Each structure stands twice: as C-alpha cells, then as structure tokens.
C-alpha cells in the first residue's frame, strides 16, 4: 500500500548526436594506378570494367 | 536520359620537358691520351677510373 508521488519537477535539457553525412569522394582509377603512364594504362586495360 | 553523368577525367598537360643535373665536372683524361705529345706504348696503359 506505498505509492511515491513527485512533488516537483526539473526541466532537462540533453544533447544527442547523430551523423547525416560523410565527404563525398571520387577516384580517377586509370590516374591512381597508371597516373601518367601510357604502358601501365594499356596494361591496365586488360582488368576491364574494374 | 536527362540528367548529370559522370566522363572521363580531365588533366592539364605539359607543354614542354626539361631535364637537370649538376654542373658538369672535369672530363675523363681522354684529352692527354689522344692529345699527347708522345703516344703511350702497351705496357703505359692507363686507367680511366671514378
């Protein structure tokens, strides 16, 4: 037969974060792997739509 | 279809090469072989080293 009741109240405020995004990036793939290089591009033509 | 598609990667080229070493030491004794006031025999070889 124990009931407890508040008899007053605090307003909190918290703090929740929370990532929407990430950098955007872009690899130039015949540039990385044959920056420059015309026996290495035409090597590298032989892996296709990689 | 309408809309923004993604080509090939553009690159800016050269537009000439250059190339750089040291200044030049001095040369190979060749000079005071050929340029000799008496020619060497077999046995006064030299050696062109370093």
């Not at chain 2, 090469?17 to 006031?37: G, M, W």
Request: proline letters at 5%.
């Amino acid at each position: 037969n124990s009931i407890a009741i508040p008899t007053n109240f605090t307003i909190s405020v918290t703090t929740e974060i929370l990532p929407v995004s990430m950098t955007k990036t872009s690899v130039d793939c015949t540039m990385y792997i044959c920056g420059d290089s015309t026996e290495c591009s035409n090597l590298l033509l032989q892996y296709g739509s990689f | 279809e309408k809309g923004i598609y993604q080509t090939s990667n553009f690159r800016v080229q050269p537009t000439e090469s250059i190339v750089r070493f040291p200044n030049v030491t001095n040369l190979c004794p060749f000079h005071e072989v050929f340029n000799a006031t008496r020619f060497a025999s077999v046995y006064a070889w030299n050696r062109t080293r370093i």
